[PDB]
Design an enzyme around this catalytic site. Structure first.
Site, PDB file in Angstrom:
ATOM      1  CB  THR A  72      -0.928   0.025   1.213  1.00 50.06           C
ATOM      2  OG1 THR A  72      -0.165   0.268   2.398  1.00 50.06           O
ATOM      3  CG2 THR A  72      -1.668  -1.274   1.357  1.00 50.06           C
ATOM      4  CB  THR A  73       0.077   4.597  -1.367  1.00 51.89           C
ATOM      5  OG1 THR A  73      -0.414   3.924  -2.532  1.00 51.89           O
ATOM      6  CG2 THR A  73       0.897   5.786  -1.788  1.00 51.89           C
TER       7      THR A  73
END
Lengths: 192, 225, 244, 239, 193, 237, 248, 231, 239
Positions: free
Chosen positions: C31-32
């Protein structure tokens, strides 16, 4: 150390060395034996060891080990100077928990023929053990440089006998080695 | 240190290194044991004979080990067994039983099948003797796997299938050989079915037979056949 | 290079450690995460995916504090990130024990870089499957770092890791162009929220929870603190209205 | 991990052979032939030097034959560096035994200990075996003159006459042909040199290509100087 | 304290050891054998600290038995006494020394000679015609120094031992409950009175 | 050797455990039957030659006064497991002045099984155990201990090469009202069925655990009497 | 370290492959040679520069091991450097600290050979890719020249060469060497033998030469101990080499 | 697949196949349900027997009166991890006189599991755990996966067919989370959830076990006739 | 053989050769030159990512007061070497009472590299290290270490993909000047020389952001700020 008693003296002469020791083995005042020779040899190098008789035996066996391995590796017998260094390093390896001994090295270097003694290379005479101070007195009075082997024998023998007579813990006979590059003579002395 | 898993299961659940240690045993020189009523006899079929002694090693005065397979591995087992026998005699107050020693040696072999970085012993042993105040003879086998079992007669090494079939024909499980002569005769006969003989007797009476005696048996057998 | 990629610390003929490149592929699947350096502080934000209704909201915290003054956020194999942060906490404690000052952020960065790089030296260890964004406030002000599986790290004005890294990186580029005087901490919080929301215009397969943290000399007294309550809701509102 | 690169020394083949031992034995089959002969009054050790050049100091090269103590010598075939490692261990063991018991080590005890060292490398530790075979010549008061061999497996055996190295099948054939139990050391010296001469793969046996030693009655242990090797080669009619 | 005495005569070694064991105030035992057979022709007697003596002697016995099994051969009394000396010399440097004094009497079947070695707890070894530890020598050596002859028979040796024991019983203040006497000769080890 | 001993298969199972289970299928049959009166254990003494002394085989052993074990597979591996179990039982009595429960002992053995790897033993054990015992908390219990380190309690169980047939007969014929004599004859019946050799007191061995007298192995005479009784009663089955 | 196993193993033909490959590394190395005279030993090598900007003066291909023992190598320079450090330390710890004396050449060569052998058998190491020529003097054996190979086998030589040119050099040395050769003749022959194997440029900057010779009391650095010998090892200067080459 | 031979090898896409295979171990394990309200947390486990003559294997282990877990997959690994968790709770009690937080226990397990994914010679754990506890922050449920991932949930299921129970829990979350006064109705919600994972099988007093923990409810396991109420 | 530092049949160490390839991963060139009493290091700085903090991007390290190091190769291995070198220098000063010389540090780091070439479990570091100092005895000094464990002193050196172009231009300059050093009294003119020469070799102008510059003087090693590099670049534009 003094539990067992004993004395060693070595002297240089003209192209000769003498080394001599008493034969008593004690246990404090009790005399145990008169067959306890304190002088060993490893090829042409002689080692006298005074002090605790268990350490005398242990160190003789150890130096036998080391000089045999030396001869096998080097393909030559150890010389007196090298043996003196070996003794020094082997004793200092137990700088803590010492062997309670006084070594005396005597011999003649095979190549140069120079007589050598150590306890250094104090060239006149070397003294060890319980009667050390009597021996210093005797040798410092009797010793002369460049004694011929027969006169060296008389000098070292009288030093040993008269010093031993004033030490309670040493005596019951003495042995003298007269060492020449070609020839070693062992002599036994009576004590009175 | 080196810890590689050398003895491991194959997909069919075999341990190939133990099977190959058994192949080393099978290539190894024979050993034969025959238990009688009152003795166990062990035998085997430019070398200097004095310093190429019997393959039959005493582990203690009452108990004897023969082997087949790798000689060098066997020296390791024999030394361990001797040390354990002296240790038991020291820490406890009795010599080892033959089964105790056998179990110890089989345990050593088993452990080397399940320990990292070690090969199994390429050795099988016959362990013969008497327990210290017993007169039932004992004859055990150990194997590289560390299996051990007692035998009435057994053979290990090169020809051992043929010699074992002979012993199965000729050893009687309900009428075992009754004298040393009968045990020796059966052992020699089994070895000739293709010489050195040790007789183990009670009270630490272990005797290698003279070659002249063995040749007496051999010639008698060759005269009766 | 199918010959040279089976074992960490092997050089390929072209000089590459392929296991580190594959660990980077593990990071790119994460995930970012982002970081923003502001005029007196740093802001960290992370996309937390809501894999189901059943996850407890606000509870599966992904940002980690180190000491009291360092924030760490990472993308990739979350357990490797926890492992790295545990080492970081040990390093910070050791530094403060010997030197009673809090560990400087560049010092901490090197301690982590050496530890990560050591996981590239031997075939008996795996590279870290995380890229870590970390930073904080020290006596020399704010510092922001991003650390790669190779052990490579640099200081950044803004940083992004994970699946949305490219869109985040472009928005951070624009943010750094438009605010050359330096962004404020509260505005950086709002921007971080916007940037995470924009990065979640990728990876939209699931819903997500925004988590933000910050460390600011004015706003937190140089201590790392989570953004909570009013300011977090305000940031989410700003991000949603900036989209909608 | 490293498992990929481990060759797994110390494993059985399916035939129950130790392949590294068999391959070390192959290595030794290319080393210079060494011969031991036990006479009635002593033991001969003889060995061929494989390395030769006019520029070698044959007078100081001592690569085949080593003293282990005053009573025991070895001849070496194979990797001389591995042999020197083992020889140093054996020398130390002999001196430890003398220190403990105040008696010279029995020859078999020394041989067994060195063979056990070699066995260990075949069973544990994942290292390659020592690539050396030894012939041991010794005397002790239990068995007198004794001649042993040992190989990488750590097997050892006693012999009346033995060869190790390259030509050993031929050498053992010739030794079987000509050996006798009554033979003297001076007979065994001839048999050794004649066997080396008939087995060498060089054009002619010469004093530079030879090392020679004897143990004979105390027991004396002589490594021949090259001039003595010339004398013995002319006395035997080989040169 | 314990009495151990040894006399090497022409054909044999005689060892004599006191039977008492005393703990604190009481004689617990009057029949204790302070010896271990190390080999069929080697006997060791021991004296010293309680527990140390038997632990040491049994460790030595096990090691000599192990050597004999491994070699199928009997060590000389010389080699045994060297080994025992080495173990005692180690123990002086150890964390808890064996406080153990030993006499080793053996018959060397290669030399066909009896041998008697005295080893103290320090590892001081000496081969002697006759030997003692502790105070037993203080009372006995003048008798032995006066009467001992190297060519004595076993029976003359035993009579001289009887005189030594009588002198100990007269002048030594402890009651040692007499001695067990063992003879080591070419036929091995036997117990005598 | 390509694969490390600790690796999972794609199916999520440890290869070496699976292969150890394949080794146990080759083992000689062991059968356990639990009853409210006692647990019976019987084993096939698969003698490899008539010169083998069947009485040395000892595939049933005492673990403690009220706990016994039957083994199948690589039975040399069992000696370590049994040494551990005996040590655990004695140590438990030492530390608590009470007998170990049969389940706690079985767990102690199963905790041993997966402690294999590199960087520990090199491999799993190749032996399965039937652990039978009595304790005051849970009575007569039979457990199957497996190289997976898992165990189940069983009313009756067969292990080894005969196990699938024997277990099908145990599913048929076990019931909670079996007496110990009935369990003895049922063990002998199923051994006789799945043994290739003719059942006799030399080919097989029996034991039981009873709280009144603990674990005892039956002598050959008693077993022969029971085999005779089976041979008689088989006329009516 | 999980590499507890040997990387050098016997092949079915009985070869130790890694040792043969190390010898191939040596045989590709820059040529080195040694010549023993009645009254000294010469060791010499080409100094190949890695760059015209490199200071070849900063790289010592010839190393003092003891005041009377020198070494040169062919093959892997870094391995040689590490072996020199180990040889120096072992000459001290295994001998000088015990006997108060520097080791004889043969015993130090044995210690080096031991270090090299252990790299052929111990876990997780390759062999050293170097062959050494070790020249020395000692009072009892006199002048000695030894070659040590990657196996740790060592051989005394009257003269030898190692590296790429060693076949032509050894043939020339067999032509030129004799029992009556003096050290100045040995140096002349060494310079001739290198001339035939250098990559053109041949001068005191492209050559490193050392001798074991007379004691050099001027290099001792102190006075007043008549028994303390000056070092017998001496590296020749580039100017001494040029002076000799101009007269060659 | 050259990349699945050890944990220390990434595939070209960054996967750790040995970890995935250890998760397949869990997927082969029988279903366990966990669910919680604010006051109580419940575990429900379907046990499997080996055969009609065998016992059903234990699926639930008490750590403390405040904590316990349920396992799916390789039960000896669950024993190892349960003993470790017991040691951590014990240490917290002995040294700080504080009940170990369930979240911190989960992170301690995460960290223990991660080491086996990162270094050679070990292996991942083959077991998934559902941990329930009650602490000063109320009821907690954690799912542990031997990748080292630990997640705090209101409900979940692990093991075979567990997605059916998980779907039911997702559908009914807003009901069961409110069940604060009534532990038996939360248990019944969990038993109805696990029923959605059953295939060709029924719940019985033999195969069903339940645990509950909560505000004044020390961690207790119901099995046998104690679960007949909830069937 | 391709995967671990064992010999190939050609006697090569492929992993060492491939570690040399890693040294060019960064595509950066560095240059070092000696003055009369200074040493200068020039390295290219390439910071294309606008989000980087350029002050953190450096391949020049201050090892001690007196020693600088410039690295060619990936920054993680560079930082490993730098930390080790710093520890070695501090430890040397503690053990021996004086500042570690640059050549001694280069020897020590080269020996560590050799260990990585010889022990299979450690890979080589993919870096080339250039150490610079003004030595108390040797004066201005450049020593460069590589993955083989080779090191040597240099009059001047360059490292990187274009090292041949820079090196040949330097060689031509020394051919033009007949000296082993740059004949200038003060380091600012040596910096200006080195920059001018890098420009001429690479064919590219530099902004103050495109370079980093290290100067060793007798008192200290120090790195120039971007504004000091600006002052030198405008000096070149005006001189």
């Amino acid at each position: 150390s003094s539990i067992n008693g004993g004395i060693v003296v070595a002297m240089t002469g003209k192209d000769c060395v003498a080394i001599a020791c008493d034969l008593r083995l004690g246990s404090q005042s009790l005399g145990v034996s008169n067959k306890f020779e304190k002088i060993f040899h490893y090829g042409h190098v002689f080692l006298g060891i005074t002090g605790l008789a268990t350490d005398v035996t242990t160190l003789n066996e150890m130096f036998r080990y080391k000089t045999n391995l030396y001869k096998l590796k080097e393909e030559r017998a150890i010389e007196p100077e090298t043996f003196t260094q070996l003794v020094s390093s082997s004793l200092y390896e137990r700088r803590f928990g010492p062997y309670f001994v006084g070594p005396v090295v005597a011999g003649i270097n095979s190549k140069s023929g120079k007589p050598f003694i150590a306890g250094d290379e104090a060239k006149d005479f070397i003294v060890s053990g319980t009667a050390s101070d009597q021996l210093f007195g005797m040798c410092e009075s009797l010793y002369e440089p460049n004694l011929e082997p027969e006169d060296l024998f008389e000098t070292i023998s009288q030093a040993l006998l008269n010093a031993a007579d004033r030490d309670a813990l040493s005596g019951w006979g003495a042995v003298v080695y007269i060492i020449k590059k070609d020839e070693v003579v062992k002599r036994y002395l009576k004590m009175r | 240190g080196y810890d590689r898993a050398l003895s491991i299961f194959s997909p069919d659940g075999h341990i190939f290194q133990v099977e190959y240690a058994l192949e080393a045993v099978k290539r190894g020189t024979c050993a034969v044991g025959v238990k009688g009523k009152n003795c166990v006899v062990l035998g085997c079929e430019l070398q200097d004979t004095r310093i190429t002694p019997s393959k039959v090693s005493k582990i203690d005065s009452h108990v004897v080990l023969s082997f087949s397979g790798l000689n060098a591995d066997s020296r390791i087992l024999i030394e361990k067994a001797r040390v354990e026998a002296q240790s038991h005699r020291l820490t406890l107050e009795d010599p080892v039983t033959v089964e105790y020693l056998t179990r110890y040696v089989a345990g050593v072999q088993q452990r080397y099948t399940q320990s990292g970085g070690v090969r199994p012993f390429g050795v099988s042993t016959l362990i013969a003797g008497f327990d210290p105040r017993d007169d039932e003879p004992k004859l055990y086998q150990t194997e590289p796997s560390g299996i051990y079992s007692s035998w009435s007669a057994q053979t290990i090494g090169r020809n051992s299938k043929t010699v074992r079939e002979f012993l199965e024909k000729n050893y009687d499980r309900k009428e075992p050989p009754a004298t040393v002569e009968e045990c020796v005769k059966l052992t020699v006969r089994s070895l000739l079915e293709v010489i050195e003989i040790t007789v183990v007797k009670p009270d630490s009476d272990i005797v290698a037979l003279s070659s002249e005696e063995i040749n007496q048996y051999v010639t008698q057998i060759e005269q009766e056949k | 290079g199918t010959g040279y990629d089976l074992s960490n610390s092997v050089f390929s003929p072209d000089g590459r450690n392929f296991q580190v490149e594959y660990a980077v592929k593990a990071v790119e699947n994460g995930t970012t995460s982002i970081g923003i350096k502001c005029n007196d502080g740093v802001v960290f934000a992370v996309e937390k995916l809501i894999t189901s209704k059943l996850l407890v909201p606000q509870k599966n915290v992904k940002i980690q504090v180190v000491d009291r003054h360092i924030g760490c956020v990472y993308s990739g194999l979350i357990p490797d990130g926890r492992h790295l942060v545990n080492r970081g906490r040990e390093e910070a404690a050791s530094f403060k024990k010997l030197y009673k000052t809090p560990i400087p952020i560049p010092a901490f960065a090197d301690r982590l870089g050496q530890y990560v790089q050591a996981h590239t030296l031997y075939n008996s260890v795996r590279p870290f499957g995380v890229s870590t964004i970390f930073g904080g406030v020290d006596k020399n002000g704010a510092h922001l770092y991003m650390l790669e599986p190779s052990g490579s790290y640099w200081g950044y004005k803004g940083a992004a890791t994970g699946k949305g890294r490219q869109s985040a990186k472009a928005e951070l580029e624009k943010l750094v162009d438009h605010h050359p005087e330096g962004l404020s901490a509260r505005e950086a919080v709002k921007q971080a929220a916007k940037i995470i929301y924009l990065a979640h215009e990728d990876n939209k397969e699931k819903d997500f929870e925004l988590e933000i943290s910050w460390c600011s000399l004015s706003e937190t007294n140089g201590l790392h603190k989570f953004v909570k309550g009013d300011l977090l809701q305000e940031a989410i509102d700003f991000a949603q209205k900036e989209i909608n | 991990g490293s498992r990929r690169y481990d060759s797994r020394t110390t494993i059985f083949s399916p035939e129950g052979r130790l392949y590294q031992v068999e391959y070390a034995l192959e290595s030794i089959s290319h080393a210079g032939t060494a011969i031991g002969i036990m006479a009635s009054d002593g033991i001969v050790l003889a060995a061929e030097r494989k390395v030769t050049s006019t520029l070698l100091e044959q007078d100081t090269s001592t690569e085949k034959l080593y003293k282990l103590n005053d009573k025991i010598a070895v001849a070496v075939a194979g990797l001389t560096a591995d042999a020197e490692i083992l020889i140093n261990t054996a020398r130390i063991h002999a001196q430890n035994y003398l220190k403990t018991y105040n008696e010279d080590i029995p020859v078999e005890i020394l041989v067994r200990r060195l063979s056990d060292i070699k066995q260990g490398y075949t069973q544990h530790g994942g290292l390659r075996p020592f690539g050396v075979s030894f012939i041991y010549a010794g005397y002790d008061d239990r068995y007198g003159y004794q001649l042993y061999t040992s190989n990488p497996s750590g097997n050892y055996t006693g012999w009346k006459a033995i060869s190790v190295g390259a030509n050993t099948s031929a050498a053992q054939t010739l030794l079987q042909m000509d050996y006798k139990d009554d033979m003297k050391v001076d007979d065994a010296i001839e048999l050794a040199l004649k066997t080396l001469s008939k087995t060498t793969d060089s054009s002619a046996l010469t004093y530079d290509r030879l090392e020679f030693a004897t143990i004979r009655k105390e027991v004396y242990q002589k490594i021949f100087k090259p001039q003595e090797i010339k004398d013995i080669l002319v006395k035997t009619g080989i040169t | 304290m314990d009495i151990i005495l040894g006399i090497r005569v022409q054909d044999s070694v005689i060892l004599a050891s006191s039977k008492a064991v005393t703990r604190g105030i009481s004689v617990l035992k009057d029949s204790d054998d302070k010896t271990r057979q190390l080999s069929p022709h080697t006997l060791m007697s021991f004296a010293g600290e309680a527990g140390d003596t038997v632990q040491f002697a049994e460790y030595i016995q096990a090691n000599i038995q192990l050597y004999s099994i491994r070699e199928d051969y009997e060590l000389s009394p010389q080699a045994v006494s060297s080994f025992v000396r080495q173990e005692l010399a180690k123990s002086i440097r150890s964390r808890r020394p064996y406080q153990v004094n030993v006499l080793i009497g053996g018959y060397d079947k290669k030399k066909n000679k009896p041998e008697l070695y005295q080893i103290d707890y320090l590892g001081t070894k000496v081969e002697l015609p006759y030997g003692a530890h502790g105070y037993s020598g203080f009372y006995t050596f003048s008798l032995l120094d006066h009467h001992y002859r190297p060519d004595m028979t076993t029976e003359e040796g035993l009579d001289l031992l009887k005189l030594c024991v009588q002198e100990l019983e007269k002048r030594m203040p402890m009651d040692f409950k007499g001695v067990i006497v063992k003879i080591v000769d070419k036929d091995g080890i036997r117990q005598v009175d | 050797y390509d694969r490390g001993v600790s690796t999972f298969s794609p199916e999520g199972r440890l290869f070496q455990v699976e292969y150890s289970l394949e080794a146990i299928k080759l083992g000689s049959t062991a059968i356990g039957i639990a009853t409210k009166e006692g647990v019976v254990l019987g084993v096939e003494k698969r003698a490899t030659s008539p010169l083998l002394e069947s009485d040395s085989i000892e595939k049933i052993v005492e673990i403690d006064r009220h706990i016994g074990c039957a083994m199948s597979g690589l039975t040399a591996d069992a000696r370590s497991m049994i040494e551990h179990a005996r040590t655990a039982a004695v140590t438990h009595n030492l530390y608590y002045d009470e007998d170990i429960n049969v389940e706690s002992l079985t767990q102690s053995v199963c905790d041993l099984a997966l402690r294999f790897g590199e960087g520990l033993m090199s491999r799993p054990f190749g032996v399965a155990l039937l652990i039978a015992g009595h304790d005051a908390d849970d009575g007569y219990q039979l457990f199957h201990a497996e190289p997976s380190g898992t165990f189940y309690r069983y009313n009756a169980k067969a292990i080894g090469s005969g196990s699938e047939g024997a277990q099908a007969e145990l599913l048929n014929e076990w019931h909670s009202s079996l007496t110990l004599k009935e369990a003895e004859l049922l063990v002998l019946k199923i051994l006789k069925q799945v043994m290739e050799e003719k059942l006799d007191e030399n080919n097989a061995q029996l034991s039981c655990i009873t709280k009144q007298d603990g674990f005892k192995i039956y002598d050959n005479e008693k077993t022969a009497e029971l085999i005779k009784e089976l041979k008689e009663k088989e006329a009516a089955e | 370290d999980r590499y507890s196993f040997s990387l050098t193993t016997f092949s079915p033909s009985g070869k130790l492959g890694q040792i043969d490959y190390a010898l191939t590394a040596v045989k590709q190395g820059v040529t080195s040679l040694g010549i023993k005279a009645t009254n000294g030993v010469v060791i010499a090598t080409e100094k190949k520069s890695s760059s015209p900007l490199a200071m070849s003066e900063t790289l010592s291909k010839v190393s003092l091991l003891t005041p009377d023992i020198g070494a040169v190598y062919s093959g892997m320079g870094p391995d040689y450097r590490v072996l020199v450090d180990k040889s120096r330390k072992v000459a001290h710890t295994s001998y000088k600290r015990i006997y108060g004396e520097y080791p004889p050449t043969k015993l130090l060569v044995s210690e080096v050979a031991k270090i090299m052998q252990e790299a052929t058998q111990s876990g997780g190491v390759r062999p050293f890719g170097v062959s050494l020529l070790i020249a020395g003097h000692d009072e009892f054996n006199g002048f000695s020249l030894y070659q040590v190979d990657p196996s740790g086998s060592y051989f005394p030589w009257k003269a030898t060469a190692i590296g790429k040119g060693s076949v032509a050099a050894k043939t020339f040395l067999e032509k030129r060497w004799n029992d009556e050769l003096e050290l100045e003749d040995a140096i002349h022959i060494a310079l001739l033998t290198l001339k035939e194997s250098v990559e053109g440029e041949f001068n005191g900057d492209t050559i490193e030469l050392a001798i074991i010779g007379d004691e050099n009391p001027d290099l001792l650095g102190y006075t007043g101990i008549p028994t303390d010998k000056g070092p017998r090892f001496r590296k020749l200067t580039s100017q001494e080499i040029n002076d000799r080459l101009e007269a060659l | 697949n050259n990349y699945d031979g050890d944990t220390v090898t990434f595939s070209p896409t960054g996967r750790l196949f040995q970890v995935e295979y250890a998760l397949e171990a869990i997927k082969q394990g029988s279903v366990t349900v966990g669910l919680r309200s604010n006051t109580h947390a419940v575990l429900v486990a379907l046990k499997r027997n080996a055969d009609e003559l065998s016992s059903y294997q234990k699926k639930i282990i008490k750590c403390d009166e405040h904590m316990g877990l349920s396992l799916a997959g390789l039960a000896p690994d669950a024993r190892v991890l349960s003993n470790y968790l017991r040691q951590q709770c014990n240490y917290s009690s002995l040294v700080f006189n504080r009940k170990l937080a369930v979240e911190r226990a989960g992170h301690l397990l995460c960290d223990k599991a991660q080491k086996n994914t990162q270094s050679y010679g070990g292996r991942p754990y083959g077991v998934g755990l559902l941990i329930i506890g009650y602490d000063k922050s109320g009821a907690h449920l954690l799912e542990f996966q031997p990748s080292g991932n630990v997640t705090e949930l209101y409900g979940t299921a692990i093991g075979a067919r567990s997605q059916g129970a998980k779907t039911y829990l997702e559908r009914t979350l807003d009901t069961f989370i409110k069940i604060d006064g009534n532990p038996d109705e939360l248990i019944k919600a969990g038993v109805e959830a696990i029923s959605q994972s059953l295939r060709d099988e029924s719940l019985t007093v033999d195969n069903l076990s339940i645990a509950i923990v909560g505000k004044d409810t020390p961690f207790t396991i119901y099995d046998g006739e104690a679960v007949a109420k909830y069937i | 053989d391709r995967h671990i530092t064992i010999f190939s049949p050609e006697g090569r160490l492929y992993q060492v050769e491939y570690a040399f390839k890693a040294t060019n991963q960064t595509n950066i060139n560095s240059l070092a030159v000696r003055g009369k009493d200074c040493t200068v290091v020039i390295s290219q700085k390439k910071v294309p990512d606008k989000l980087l903090d350029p002050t953190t991007v450096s391949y020049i390290f201050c090892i001690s007061r007196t020693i600088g190091m410039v690295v060619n190769g990936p920054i993680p291995d560079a930082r490993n070497a730098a930390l080790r070198a710093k520890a070695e220098a501090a430890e040397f000063r503690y053990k021996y009472g004086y500042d570690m010389p640059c050549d001694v540090l280069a020897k020590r780091m080269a020996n560590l590299s050799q260990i990585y070439t010889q022990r299979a479990y450690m890979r080589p570091l993919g870096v080339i290290l250039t150490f610079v100092s003004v030595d108390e005895e040797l004066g201005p000094s450049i020593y460069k270490t590589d993955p083989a464990g080779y090191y040597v002193g240099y009059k001047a050196t360059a490292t990187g993909p274009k090292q041949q172009e820079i090196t040949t231009n330097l060689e031509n300059h020394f051919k033009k000047s007949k000296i082993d050093h740059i004949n200038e009294e003060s380091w600012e003119k040596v910096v200006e020389f080195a920059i001018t020469h890098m420009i001429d070799a690479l064919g590219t102008e530099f902004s103050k952001n495109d370079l980093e510059v290290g100067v060793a003087t007798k008192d200290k090693f120090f790195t120039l700020s971007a504004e000091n590099i600006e002052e030198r670049l405008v000096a070149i534009a005006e001189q």
